[PDB]
Amino acid sequence: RLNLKVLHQNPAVADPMGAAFDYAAEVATIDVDALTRDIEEVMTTSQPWWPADYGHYGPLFIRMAWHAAGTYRIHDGRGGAGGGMQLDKARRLLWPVKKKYGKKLSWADLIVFAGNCALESMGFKTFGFGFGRVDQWEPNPDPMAAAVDIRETFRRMAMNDVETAALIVGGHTDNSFLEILYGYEWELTKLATDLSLRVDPIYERITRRWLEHPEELADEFAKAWYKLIHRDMGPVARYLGPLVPKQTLLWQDPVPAVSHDLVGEAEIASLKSQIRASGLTVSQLVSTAWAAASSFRGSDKRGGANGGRIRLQPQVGWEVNDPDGDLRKVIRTLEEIQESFNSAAPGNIKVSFADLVVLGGCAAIEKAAKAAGHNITVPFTPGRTDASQEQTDVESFAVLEPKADGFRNYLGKGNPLPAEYMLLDKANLLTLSAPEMTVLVGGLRVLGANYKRLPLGVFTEASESLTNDFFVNLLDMGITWEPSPADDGTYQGKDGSGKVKWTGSRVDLVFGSNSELRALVEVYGADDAQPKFVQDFVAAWDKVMNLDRFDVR
Amino acid sequence: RLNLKVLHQNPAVADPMGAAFDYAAEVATIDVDALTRDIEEVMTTSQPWWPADYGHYGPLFIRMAWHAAGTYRIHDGRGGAGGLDKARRLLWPVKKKYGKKLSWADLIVFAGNCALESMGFKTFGFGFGRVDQNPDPMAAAVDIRETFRRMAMNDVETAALIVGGHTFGWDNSFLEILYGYEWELTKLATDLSLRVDPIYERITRRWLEHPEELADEFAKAWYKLIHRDMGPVARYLGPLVPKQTLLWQDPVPAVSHDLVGEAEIASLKSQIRASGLTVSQLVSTAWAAASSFRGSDKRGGANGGRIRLQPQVGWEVNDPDGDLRKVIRTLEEIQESFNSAAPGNIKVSFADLVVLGGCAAIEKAAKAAGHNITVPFTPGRTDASQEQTDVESFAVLEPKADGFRNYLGKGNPLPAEYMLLDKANLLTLSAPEMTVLVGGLRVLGANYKRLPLGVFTEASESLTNDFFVNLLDMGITWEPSPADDGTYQGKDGSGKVKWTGSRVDLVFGSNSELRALVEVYGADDAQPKFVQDFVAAWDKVMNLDRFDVR
């Protein structure tokens, strides 16, 4: 069955720090001016065990950082240098450095910085560095064939055309063997892979030019290495330490900084009133807010709602974010509201489109809950900005596309896992525990967010009202579930009379037929457990909205 | 290698109830005078989806509360009721009205008990509080007695359980027909075991003559079966719990005196530390008393103070030969000196003095290290006499292998580190607490027979992280491989043996998942962190069996 132990991976009980280890006020107090000297003193020595290769250990740590940062696979984001644990007899050699710092320098930061310092101290000038990789708590030779193989194995790493050549040349070496590769004939016997640069015509547009402009090789290799070790770290607000560069690069998905005073509380109330007074259905605002804030990968920290890219080309064309029913009308209405509030702004208070998307989501939930008999307030922390189309990298936002969304009953053709391990994977990416997954599924089914507004999972008698009616009616035993005669995957449920009453997908009934999920649904769908469900859903929704805010603080 | 995910089982993140919800304050506020009516209304019906019985679902919920309570393995404690999916769809109309105030284990077991009580019977009592996550004349007799001794049942409760279970599914129709006409199978025949085995028959004939005694014996046997792994009598919630206590609960006398606090604690700590007792004696005694606890059936703990009693003093791990008699005599003398000469109606019990000696020894050791701390101590324990503890029942709590005391006895089903992992799982200790407790106990001096296996400290009797600093040191090479077999040794670059280790010590310096939790306490600036976390872990271990304070 489902492995629901993946949702609570790396809990706070196995963390030897507990609750007072914000890894941003410690490493910001690091002494980089002296840590580099300690690294140099450790690396430029021999040891009885593991004897030195001509002294310097620079090659060792450079190849180690490379083989630890080359695991990042774009198709799901996991890998990189900041995750897992990728020889580990080095942790018995870098220990004389970690001993002097301890909790102010995680193992990932120390290993990657050892590699970077080795590069810096072997006749080079690297780009920059940024600490903040938290430590996981489990720490035939054919030219064309080789060329296509390296192109594919770096395309999975998101290295395109010039970073591939720069990385290969630098790793094998700012020219020291480029002049070797053009000096004479080359033969073979029982390495010629580097000849792929000399053979492949796409490489020749840059590689042969690099013989005349060696400084270009150095610059592009510095940029390629900086990309290589920082690809699995996130947007540039987790980049801690006094080493980060002063410029931002287009592969980071940059967002403009705030140039306007953030909205207070009276302005929040006025905007919340102005949104739900424009004639927007709750199923529109909630769907748009979830769409903007459920394209987030908690492994590569890339995506999220910040930047407000749901109106941009990469994220509006997706079939999940159906741009035919309502994702142009909603965006036009919110843009008009933003312009109206910006023009007659009370002072220097301005609202950015990402703020309005998340605010529309929160106001829609508040209105639905107020219509459900309760009186709740959804927390909203402003500060998001809007990223222009020139800063979105249309070709990069093509893997964040959800091939299958579990909270919206979207199931695209061609899926690896049938219909509910993809929901588990999505809930793992958003870093959602099992109770939060269950409460979010229930709230989104009841509110109305299903793709194409299908009635697959809407168990509520009267929609647009945040109640636990997806949980009460799921456990009801007056209805029996059998696969539909039209075998599309639906599980139409019939009552005791013999007429069809509800209709479900594999997600709803895997909540209703598992063991742990059944226990959670029984907790959330009892009698006199509506207020608990409302509070838990508001907390889960706020966490989802603010997922990509703390690391872009 | 090791599976460190077993230590953090059932975290607080997967609990939908939050960290502010306690079962005791909720379930005591339900009225069992109406839950019984709801259960009876649900269990007397015919749901179309589930083919009902004649007219009553009872005979299916006794057999459901039995097979969910006859899986209690005494050898480790796991199983029982506190640890079909078609009944979960039938008892829902009852759990719906209650929800948070009635866990599934309590509801299913209480449905079984109510069905038994409503089938012409008068049961003993109930306590809520179970949270949720072939010719064989003698062969059958020996098989049933073995499979019921695996659940710790006597020779009278076995017959009572068999007769009752075969009756409810007094009437005594299972005994009158047992001897009616040449009753013998010539193809049930397992029931002949009572009719052939002399030990069973001796009481079975009396029951056939004294039917009224069978009702009492079966009531007590059923009460034992239901509440076998629920814990001491202080965990029984609800208004149904009986007013008497039984010898299988490991009862302790109630407090009949005031409780020492905040000045008598200081006086007793000074008197303990001024009696000429080594830190390696007080810490070892306190750990021995408070590390015989099974966090699966909640049986054991320091409460009751049985370290001086026969079941727990004879164990080889406690080592009664060298130092467990001098310590106990000294603490008993201190108790007798502080009881009679006490200022008023204030008194101290021997279990309190054992735990207080442990805390005072740790305080003295830490003060010798260079810090100045106070180990919190919550009194309340009492002393259980010898007549209130069973020699035969406690023979299974004996640790055949202790990892924190570096004790490894013959007959090891698993290597020396999986036993440590299982022991730390029983005490409900997370991985950081396991590592810190191992380091602190090695440094303080608690090893069985005072062996220098794992003592990496240059000068003992000082609570420091020197077990962590010297373990990660790479100036020492371990002559045998750290993961093959035997006891290792540490040799420096000069070829001279410096440290001596064991398979339990050299896992916190060779396991990539556990060597990460020794680089947090083994650092340069992480001495006070280690001291504070060791005090927290020691307090958690001491207060494991304090169910009357929570």
Residue numbers in the entry:
A (entry chain A): 42 to 127, 141 to 193, 238 to 271, 329 to 345, 378 to 740
B (entry chain B): 42 to 124, 141 to 190, 238 to 273, 328 to 345, 378 to 740
Published text:
In Mycobacterium tuberculosis the multifunctional heme enzyme KatG is indispensable for activation of isoniazid (INH), a first-line pro-drug for treatment of tuberculosis. The homodimeric structure is predominantly α-helical with each protomer (∼80 kDa) composed of two domains. The N-terminal domain contains a heme b and substrate binding site, which are essential for enzymatic function. A covalently linked “MYW catalytic triad” is formed by the conserved residues, Met255, Tyr229, and Trp107, which is essential for catalase activity (Jakopitsch et al., 2003, 2004; Santoni et al., 2004).
A cryo-EM map to 3.4 Å resolution was obtained for the T275P variant. The structure again displays significant areas of disorder compared with the WT KatG. The loop containing the Thr275 residue (residues 274–329) displays no density and therefore could not be modeled. Likewise, fragmented density within the heme pocket was not sufficient to satisfactorily model a heme in either protomers. In addition, other heme pocket residues, such as Trp107 and His270, are significantly perturbed compared with the WT KatG structure. Furthermore, no density was observed for the loop containing Tyr229, a residue that is part of the MYW catalytic triad, thus suggesting that the crosslink is not present in this KatG variant. The cryo-EM structure of the T275P variant reveals a considerably disordered structure compared with the WT protein. Several loop regions surrounding the heme pocket that are well defined in the WT protein cannot be modeled owing to the absence of density. The MYW catalytic triad is no longer formed and we observe no density for the Tyr229 residue (a residue part of the MYW triad). As expected from our heme binding assays, the structure of the T275P variant before heme loading displayed little density for a well-defined bound heme.
